Design a protein around this ligand. Structure first.
Ligand SMILES: CC(=O)N[C@H]1[C@H](O[C@H]2C[C@@H](C(=O)NCCS(=O)(=O)O)[NH2+][C@@H]2CO)O[C@H](CO)[C@@H](OS(=O)(=O)O)[C@@H]1O
Length: 618
């Protein structure tokens, strides 16, 4: 027998197992005893009839298999099965220490109360209760025997309504207030009203006693009315401060809540002066920084100077703010002072280090740390590394991921450097980037920006105007080179193409044979629909990589509105730095820099922005 024979029997046993030919599976499994991935086939057999599986069998799977990611999911999973069974004496014997999952922990503490360890159940119920996030259904039987025990503190109860309202969980607020501790039963209708309809907030304030609870409830509802109508909220602040005997620091916070809502170029000149007053009076670095960003995207050189200076000493240390202080200093004629700041920034890594070298006309120097010439045995020789080798062979990238996480996680910065290089050398490109992140090996440039899928980006950007490096830069940022990633909200694959976008792109460009979203997990299909959407977005924004990158992430239209606000008034960097969306702002900064490292590795000059990008006005 041999590893190659073992791979055909694995593929063949998975076919029969998926088609349910259990007689063939039965026959075939004991032979696969020595294949790296046999724990997975055992895990599959066990989870296949879990409802009538004995604790002995599950306990021995877990016991022999400590480094294996699905063994841990089985603990938390069999705990809930013993809970379904109502075997509370079996659950504690199986899982003596709390499990990792929230459903599992709820069940584990309800088991403690059923086996007489009550004060342990209440240490668990209290810590599962202090949260405005809705908990598992499992947990509802814990919290009722707790509450019924008289051991539930009435403040622990009000604090969960305080946490639920802050978290936007207006539903948990209504159930919570719905069956309430008799000590607070007079404010229970007011709290349901406020959560339902926030505009009632002044009535809440002017009705209930002003305690710190009622003030925090009224503050969160207030934040909601400023979002519906900023003028309503602005004028409501004197009555609210009165009704609740609000201290000055409390009143400054109501002003910041409204100030945030008056940041457009559609607020009345009365609103603008009110706003800037509140902001000049604020202890909030974020509100002041949004304000600097407003001076920047409007070309206001005086507001920039004024507001930049109001930033806390700590904030002024940030690369962008260090760059816009040297920007203003250069206007005022203070050349040496300013070029000291741009030469120091040029010693660091990233967007502003590169913008600075470009701005004063010097060559940016890339610092690339050499990765070790030896990746010795122990790492490279284990059990877990053999499961990783196989999982990658079968393109099981997200499973390979979880196995690599455990493996790189407790080694020294040198072995994590060897592990990156090893993966780099077997062309496991997403595993190279992961070991780099994990081991924070930030100046190991080769292993962080590997030239992945070169011939396919080559091919699919040959009849297109978008440079190849800019295409690999988008993929690098989107998925960090994992073919099978799927975002929270549906974005799939190598270039993280939304389904709705894949549909419209295959229609505009008349692309053949793309029937379903799952095809977005194929490298070549994803690179074809994706480079097609990126060339579409590039050409309608005049071949400018600032506009095409923010357009691919947020869409065409949001970018078109941002071009409407600045209106020809500002420069490239100030257009980037003033994008009102944190994700898209961060996005353009990484795609522009990453594009410079792929150009460098492809042999061309790693300059951050083209002459037509740098000279245009925005
Ligand atoms: C390539 C692609 O599909 N791009 C789409 C983009 O995806 C973004 C969405 C984002 C995403 O999934 N972000 C994470 C969301 S979360 O924080 O994890 O919840 N990444 C994707 C590609 O970069 O979302 C915007 C918004 O509609 C779309 O613009 S619009 O259709 O014209 O309005 C745009 O077409």
């Amino acid at each position: 027998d041999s590893l190659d024979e073992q791979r055909s029997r694995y593929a063949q046993i998975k076919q029969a197992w998926d088609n349910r030919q259990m007689d063939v599976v039965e026959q075939m499994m004991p032979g696969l005893k020595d294949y790296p991935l046999y724990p997975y086939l055992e895990y599959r057999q066990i989870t296949d009839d879990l409802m009538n599986q004995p604790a002995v069998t599950v306990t021995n799977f877990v016991r022999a298999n400590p480094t294996l990611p699905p063994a841990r999911t089985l603990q938390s999973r069999f705990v809930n099965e013993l809970a379904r069974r109502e075997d509370w004496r079996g659950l504690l014997a199986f899982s003596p220490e709390k499990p990792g999952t929230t459903e599992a922990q709820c069940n584990y503490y309800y088991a403690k109360w059923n086996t007489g360890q009550s004060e342990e159940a209440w240490q668990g119920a209290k810590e599962l209760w202090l949260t405005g996030k809705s908990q598992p259904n499992a947990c509802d039987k814990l919290f009722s025997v707790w509450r019924a025990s008289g051991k539930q503190d009435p403040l622990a109860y009000l604090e969960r309504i305080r946490l639920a309202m802050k978290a936007g969980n207006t539903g948990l607020v209504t159930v919570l207030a719905g069956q309430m501790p008799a000590d607070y039963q007079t404010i229970a209708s007011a709290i349901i009203s406020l959560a339902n309809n926030p505009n009632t907030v002044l009535t809440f304030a002017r009705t209930t006693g002003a305690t710190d609870f009622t003030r925090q409830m009224a503050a969160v509802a207030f934040a909601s009315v400023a979002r519906q109508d900023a003028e309503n909220a602005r004028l409501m602040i004197p009555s609210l401060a009165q009704a609740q005997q609000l201290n000055e620091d409390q009143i400054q916070e109501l002003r910041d809540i409204v100030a945030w809502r008056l940041m457009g170029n559609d607020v009345t000149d009365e609103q603008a002066k009110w706003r800037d007053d509140a902001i000049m009076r604020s202890q909030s670095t974020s509100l002041i920084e949004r304000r600097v960003r407003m001076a920047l995207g409007t070309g206001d050189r005086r507001g920039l100077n004024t507001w930049l200076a109001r930033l806390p000493m700590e904030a002024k240390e940030k690369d962008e703010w260090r760059y816009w202080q040297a920007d203003l200093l250069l206007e005022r004629g203070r050349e040496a002072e300013a070029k000291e700041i741009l030469h120091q920034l040029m010693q660091q890594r990233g967007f502003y280090p590169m913008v600075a070298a470009q701005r004063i006309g010097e060559e940016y120097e890339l610092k690339i740390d050499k990765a070790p010439q030896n990746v010795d045995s122990a790492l490279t020789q284990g059990p877990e590394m053999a499961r990783v080798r196989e999982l990658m062979y079968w393109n099981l990238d997200n499973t390979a991921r979880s196995e690599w996480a455990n493996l790189v996680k407790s080694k020294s910065k040198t072995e994590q450097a060897q592990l990156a290089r090893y993966a780099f050398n077997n062309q496991w490109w997403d595993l190279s980037v992961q070991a780099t992140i994990a081991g924070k090996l930030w100046d190991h440039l080769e292993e962080r920006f590997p030239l992945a899928y070169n011939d396919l980006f080559k091919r699919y950007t040959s009849g297109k105007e978008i440079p190849q490096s800019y295409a690999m830069a988008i993929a690098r940022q989107e998925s960090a080179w994992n073919p099978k990633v799927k975002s929270p909200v549906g974005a799939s694959g190598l270039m993280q193409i939304m389904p709705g976008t894949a549909t419209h792109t295959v229609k505009m460009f008349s692309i053949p044979g793309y029937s379903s979203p799952g095809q977005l997990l194929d490298p070549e299909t994803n690179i074809n629909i994706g480079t097609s959407y990126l060339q579409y977005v590039y050409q309608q924004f005049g071949n400018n990589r600032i506009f095409s990158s923010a357009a691919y992430n947020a869409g065409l239209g949001r970018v078109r509105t941002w071009l409407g606000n600045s209106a020809g008034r500002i420069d490239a960097v100030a257009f980037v730095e003033s994008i009102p969306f944190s994700e898209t702002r961060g996005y353009v900064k990484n795609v522009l820099a990453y594009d410079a490292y792929y150009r460098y590795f492809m042999g061309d000059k790693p300059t951050l922005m083209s002459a037509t990008e740098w000279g245009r006005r925005y």
